[PDB]
Design an enzyme around this catalytic site. Structure first.
Site, PDB file in Angstrom:
ATOM      1  N   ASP A  37       0.788  -1.235   0.000  1.00 37.80           N
ATOM      2  CA  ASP A  37       0.000   0.000   0.000  1.00 37.80           C
ATOM      3  C   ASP A  37       0.824   1.292   0.000  1.00 37.80           C
ATOM      4  OD1 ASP A  37      -2.125   1.843   0.455  1.00 37.80           O
ATOM      5  OD2 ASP A  37      -2.546   1.154   2.481  1.00 37.80           O
ATOM      6  N   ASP A 222      -2.393   5.518  -5.090  1.00 34.85           N
ATOM      7  CA  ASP A 222      -2.634   4.527  -4.026  1.00 34.85           C
ATOM      8  C   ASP A 222      -2.802   3.056  -4.514  1.00 34.85           C
ATOM      9  OD1 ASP A 222      -3.239   3.442  -1.514  1.00 34.85           O
ATOM     10  OD2 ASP A 222      -5.038   4.644  -1.179  1.00 34.85           O
TER      11      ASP A 222
END
Ligand SMILES: COCCCOc1cc(C(=O)N(C[C@@H]2CNC[C@H]2OC(=O)NCc2ccccc2)C(C)C)ccc1OC
Ligand SMILES: *[C@@H]1O[C@H](CO)[C@@H](O)[C@H](O)[C@H]1NC(C)=O
Length: 336
Positions: A37, A222
């Site tokens: 992430d 992201d």
């Protein structure tokens, strides 16, 4: 310090919404399915100490420190809040295996893991690829600890997210990129400021006309997010232009009208990054009697990071992404 080693982690693609790899924690290694992430900087896995009254801890792999000989106690509390839910627990230290690289890492042992959304999670935990500036309890991120080893050919990491299957789900390269998964050359956009994987967006166009982000806006890149997301107002204007209906958590179009939808372009750096309806519609059928979900959602991100757009898996599937820590920039190339 720069070495001669690149390391890769093969990813699994679950339904084009979740992409995760495998890591080992402790001695002997306890393996976990984790999301890599860029939108977060903490490493966490569910703990053995999580109450079995949290059903998510009954359906996920739990880290048991009592079974690791390399474990070092800490116990400092930590709470990680996201747009989808919240996790809490405590800090622990142990040896983490990530594609060959063995690193001593501080991570969170999550004791409170809500059913929403973690009962829908295929992954057990998270490996934050963000900067120390965004790390809760200012814990050193795993990439900063890997850089410290001076083994990587370059101070960069790259993401490849494939389109759903039975072959390769995706791939993260630590220390470089994989030319087998991109074509043409990378076009970089510098970060607005160090500490966040966020770049400036010059405009968003539906069809041919620059309908949104006309005066400029922010774009967060992201890898831990499933969709492309904008502010509630932005997505309202976008959806009105597409002819989409708002539902509880998603936007839909009738399945038959899916292929006819216009191209969506994102102006980043010099170039225009275009997605066709095939890149953003879950074309499950071609029926006028069924509803098809779009891979674009509203997400109001608060300051300091927001209001911002977020370019998640929907974007990365089309564009192979390189995260440059050395030059504080993000590169994009058309994915193969
Ligand atoms: C592409 O496959 C990856 C897995 C996709 O499936 C899921 C993701 C999440 C999730 O939401 N996250 C955390 C977000 C990504 N980074 C930031 C954070 O969301 C914000 O809070 N974003 C807004 C933001 C970002 C950065 C700074 C401030 C605010 C998981 C833990 C990684 C929850 C449940 C899921 O499946 C059932
Ligand atoms: C936990 O780790 C942090 C790392 O910054 C350290 O400063 C702190 O003293 C540690 N706490 C314990 C109880 O070991």
């Amino acid at each position: 310090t720069l070495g001669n080693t690149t390391s890769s982690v093969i990813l699994t693609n679950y339904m084009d919404t979740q992409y995760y790899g495998e890591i080992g924690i402790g001695t002997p290694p306890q393996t976990f399915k984790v999301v890599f992430d860029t939108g977060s900087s903490n490493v966490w896995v569910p703990s053995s100490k999580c109450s079995r009254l949290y059903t998510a801890c009954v359906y996920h792999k739990l880290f048991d420190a009592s079974d690791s000989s390399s474990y070092k106690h800490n116990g400092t509390e930590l709470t990680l809040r996201y747009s989808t839910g919240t996790v809490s627990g405590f800090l622990s230290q142990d040896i983490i295996t990530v594609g060959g690289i063995t690193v001593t890492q501080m991570f969170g042992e999550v004791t409170e893991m809500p059913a929403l959304p973690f009962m829908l999670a295929e992954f057990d935990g998270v490996v934050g690829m963000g900067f120390i500036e965004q790390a809760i309890g200012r814990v050193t991120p795993i990439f900063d600890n890997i850089i410290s080893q001076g083994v990587l050919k370059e101070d960069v990491f790259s993401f490849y997210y494939n389109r759903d299957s039975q072959s390769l789900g995706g791939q993260i390269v630590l220390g470089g990129s994989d030319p087998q998964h991109y074509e043409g050359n990378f076009h970089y956009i510098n970060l607005i400021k160090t500490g966040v994987w966020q770049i400036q967006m010059k405009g968003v166009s539906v069809g041919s006309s620059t309908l949104l982000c006309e005066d400029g806006c922010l774009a967060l890149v992201d890898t831990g997010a499933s969709y492309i997301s904008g502010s509630t107002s932005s997505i309202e204007k976008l959806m009105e232009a597409l002819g989409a209906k708002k539902r509880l958590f998603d936007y839909v179009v009738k399945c038959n009208e899916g292929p006819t939808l216009p191209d969506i372009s994102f102006h980043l750096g010099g170039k225009e990054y275009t997605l066709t309806s095939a890149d953003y519609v879950f074309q499950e059928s071609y029926s006028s009697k069924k509803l098809c979900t779009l891979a674009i959602h509203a997400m109001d991100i608060p300051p300091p990071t927001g209001p911002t757009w977020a370019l998640g898996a929907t974007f990365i599937r089309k564009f192979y992404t390189e995260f440059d820590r050395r030059n504080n920039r993000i590169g994009f190339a058309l994915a193969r």
